[PDB]
Amino acid sequence: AFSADTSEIVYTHDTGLDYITYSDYELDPANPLAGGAAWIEGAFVPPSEARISIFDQGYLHSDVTYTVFHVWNGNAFRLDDHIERLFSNAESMRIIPPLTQDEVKEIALELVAKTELREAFVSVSITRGYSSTPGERDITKHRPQVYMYAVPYQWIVPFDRIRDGVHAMVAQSVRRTPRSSIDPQVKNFQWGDLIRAVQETHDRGFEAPLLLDGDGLLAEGSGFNVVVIKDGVVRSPGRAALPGITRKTVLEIAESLGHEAILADITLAELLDADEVLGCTTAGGVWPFVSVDGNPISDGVPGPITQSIIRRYWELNVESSSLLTPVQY
Amino acid sequence: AFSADTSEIVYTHDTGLDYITYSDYELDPANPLAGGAAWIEGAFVPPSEARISIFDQGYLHSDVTYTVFHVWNGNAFRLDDHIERLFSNAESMRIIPPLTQDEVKEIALELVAKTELREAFVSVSITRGYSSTPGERDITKHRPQVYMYAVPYQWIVPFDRIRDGVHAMVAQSVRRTPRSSIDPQVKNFQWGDLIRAVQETHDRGFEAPLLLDGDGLLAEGSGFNVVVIKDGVVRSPGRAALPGITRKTVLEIAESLGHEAILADITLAELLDADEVLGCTTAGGVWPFVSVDGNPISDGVPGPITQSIIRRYWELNVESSSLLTPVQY
Numbered sequence: 001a002f003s004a005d006t007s008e009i010v011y012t013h014d015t016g017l018d019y020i021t022y023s024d025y026e027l028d029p030a031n032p033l034a035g036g037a038a039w040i041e042g043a044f045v046p047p048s049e050a051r052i053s054i055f056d057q058g059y060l061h062s063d064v065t066y067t068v069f070h071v072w073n074g075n076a077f078r079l080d081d082h083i084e085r086l087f088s089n090a091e092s093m094r095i096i097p098p099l100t101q102d103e104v105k106e107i108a109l110e111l112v113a114k115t116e117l118r119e120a121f122v123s124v125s126i127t128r129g130y131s132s133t134p135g136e137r138d139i140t141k142h143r144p145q146v147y148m149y150a151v152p153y154q155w156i157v158p159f160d161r162i163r164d165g166v167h168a169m170v171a172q173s174v175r176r177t178p179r180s181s182i183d184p185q186v187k188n189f190q191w192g193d194l195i196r197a198v199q200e201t202h203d204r205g206f207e208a209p210l211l212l213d214g215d216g217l218l219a220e221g222s223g224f225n226v227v228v229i230k231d232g233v234v235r236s237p238g239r240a241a242l243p244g245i246t247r248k249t250v251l252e253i254a255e256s257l258g259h260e261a262i263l264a265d266i267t268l269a270e271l272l273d274a275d276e277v278l279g280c281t282t283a284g285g286v287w288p289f290v291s292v293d294g295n296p297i298s299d300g301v302p303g304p305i306t307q308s309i310i311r312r313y314w315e316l317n318v319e320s321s322s323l324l325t326p327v328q329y
Numbered sequence: 330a331f332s333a334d335t336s337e338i339v340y341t342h343d344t345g346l347d348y349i350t351y352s353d354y355e356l357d358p359a360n361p362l363a364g365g366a367a368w369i370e371g372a373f374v375p376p377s378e379a380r381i382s383i384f385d386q387g388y389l390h391s392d393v394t395y396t397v398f399h400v401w402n403g404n405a406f407r408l409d410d411h412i413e414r415l416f417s418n419a420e421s422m423r424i425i426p427p428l429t430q431d432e433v434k435e436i437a438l439e440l441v442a443k444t445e446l447r448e449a450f451v452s453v454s455i456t457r458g459y460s461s462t463p464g465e466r467d468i469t470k471h472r473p474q475v476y477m478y479a480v481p482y483q484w485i486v487p488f489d490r491i492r493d494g495v496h497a498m499v500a501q502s503v504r505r506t507p508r509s510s511i512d513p514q515v516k517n518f519q520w521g522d523l524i525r526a527v528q529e530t531h532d533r534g535f536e537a538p539l540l541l542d543g544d545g546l547l548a549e550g551s552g553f554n555v556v557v558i559k560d561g562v563v564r565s566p567g568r569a570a571l572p573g574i575t576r577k578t579v580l581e582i583a584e585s586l587g588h589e590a591i592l593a594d595i596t597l598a599e600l601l602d603a604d605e606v607l608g609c610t611t612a613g614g615v616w617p618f619v620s621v622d623g624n625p626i627s628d629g630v631p632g633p634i635t636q637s638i639i640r641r642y643w644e645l646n647v648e649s650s651s652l653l654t655p656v657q658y
């Protein structure tokens with residue numbers, strides 16, 4: 001698995017977008033971890049060797065939470081916010097992390113350094129773990145694990161669609177899992193609903209799904225938040241939506257540009273009548289949604305506030321004292 | 330992980346129950362797979378070496394289905410039914426298994442043979458798998474995996490509680506995940522709701538949870554089905570419940586004993602007013618529920634039909650042409 005030599009790993013792109021520029025560098029072919037690696041049970045290992053116990057409850061009962069942070073031009077973006085959220089999410093599940101927040105950040109940054117990646121996607125998961133015996137059933141006997149991997153930056157949406165916009169679909173075959181079953185404000189791997197939404201998107205010929213909650217209000221997408229703009233007011237679902245760190249940044253940007261930015265309940269009518277709609281997530285940043293169910297949003301092209309937010313997001317990735325943590329390569 | 334020598338593996342018990350008797354045998358200490366093993370990517374390996382790629386979507390997005398069958402006195406129980414259900418469940422998720430049903434059965438039975446276990450818990454999972462690169466996001470590019478493990482038979486409920494009964498609790502902090510988010514009739518590892526129910530059981534001082542569905546009707550428990558008996562009529566939830574193979578057996582037994590046995594919607598009032606209530610699952614068999622929320626069911630002791638079903642279930646584990654498949658040790 002994952003047998004590609006350092007020369008075969010794709011870690012940069014020509015984006016065609018003046019505000020997204022990768023670093024100009026070469027991976028060291030003598031470094032077996034160059035271009036991607038994992039931290040598992042104290043070892044830094046290449047992806048081909050990155051394996052977890054099949055008896056980990058993170059697999060057997062998806063008894064796990066996680067976060068993904070990214071690195072851009074050699075700086076982790078909002079790492080403190082990410083690890084704070086991860087630990088809050090662990091606490092929500094009554095998982096007691098075996099490492100402190102500072103220990104987690106230390107290891108994660110060292111992992112990225114070993115990969116040499118200047119632009120990276122970095123997953124940190126914390127599982128209920130496993131017990132002294134492989135068939136243990138008592139949930140209270142398992143000892144928790146932290147697993148990390150760092151791989152090239154991943155794009156949920158292609159560069160041309162960051163420019164031109166994405167054609168969204170309101171999923172009707174699923175609803176976002178209710179908080180009364182699985183809390184969507186705790187980041188998790190239980191994607192059964194989200195994957196059905198992606199499958200429906202394919203079935204109906206659209207590009208990305210937007211799910212609704214049990215009350216029929218706008219929720220979120222398959223690994224991303226949605227933001228709706230109307231008369232200069234920027235809103236995003238507060239209930240059935242992960243509290244995204246990209247979303248947080250987007251609303252901060254909106255306010256700095258002079259717009260009211262709030263979490264709120266958004267109806268389907270309000271989504272369709274919006275001036276602008278956008279999506280956001282760590283794995284891809286920010287992009288426009290120019291139609292919903294084949295109905296254009298406004299004039300069917302990316303709106304001015306969206307474009308300002310996208311540009312500003314990418315500016316903050318290159319120059320920001322408070323938001324950037326340098327990797328010590 | 331899982332460093333116990335063959336002599337330290339616990340693979341038999343004195344049950345104190347005349348109808349449950351383990352085999353009388355010794356594991357071969359010269360066999361590294363004796364007492365437990367896994368089949369992963371074509372290799373039979375001891376539990377200490379049983380590891381899956383961290384990039385498997387079965388972990389990263391719980392994009393996986395499974396079944397657990399058991400072996401008793403050297404015979405797999407309802408193996409054909411189990412693998413049929415597993416493959417139906419894979420199809421529901423649009424996962425195309427990389428092996429046929431016959432190939433899966435062949436490997437599973439060989440795995441059990443290598444462990445030497447005459448009484449075993451055997452998990453077979455089928456994941457969306459992983460792609461040529463570790464950070465691939467396209468769900469359609471992953472190549473699916475089959476993972477198996479065989480370990481000593483696991484008991485959800487202790488022997489004394491099979492005899493004396495279990496004290497159940499109706500969960501109110503969660504509802505079973507709705508079919509419109511995650512289908513509970515497809516066996517899955519997305520246990521967020523079920524685990525919250527177990528946590529609530531602990532919080533409120535009971536022994537096992539019974540969840541309700543979105544309509545407030547009886548659903549199922551944390552890895553087990555519930556069955557309610559009233560005036561000689563045996564009923565079990567048809568909607569928010571896995572179609573259990575133990576349940577199937579229980580209803581077959583009920584009919585052979587002359588009782589009407591059906592899947593149905595069961596109200597909370599009907600649960601509390603039942604003559605008898607029982608639980609059932611592959612990992613433990615069948616047991617009585619003698620109270621719900623501290624209210625006795627009937628006279629608070631296991632009922633006659635329940636006891637007849639438990640005894641008959643365990644009889645069918647030892648003598649049954651149609652239901653038993655011998656392991657070739």
Ligand SMILES: *Cc1c(COP(=O)(O)O)cnc(C)c1O
Binds near residue numbers: 187224244
């Ligand atoms: C990760 C995630 C998001 C976005 O969160 P960020 O912190 O911006 O990456 C949105 N929705 C879901 C379901 C997610 O898992």
Ligand SMILES: *Cc1c(COP(=O)(O)O)cnc(C)c1O
Binds near residue numbers: 552572573575576610
């Ligand atoms: C496995 C399972 C059952 C029981 O099914 P069997 O086929 O009898 O083992 C019941 N409920 C849930 C949620 C399960 O995962």
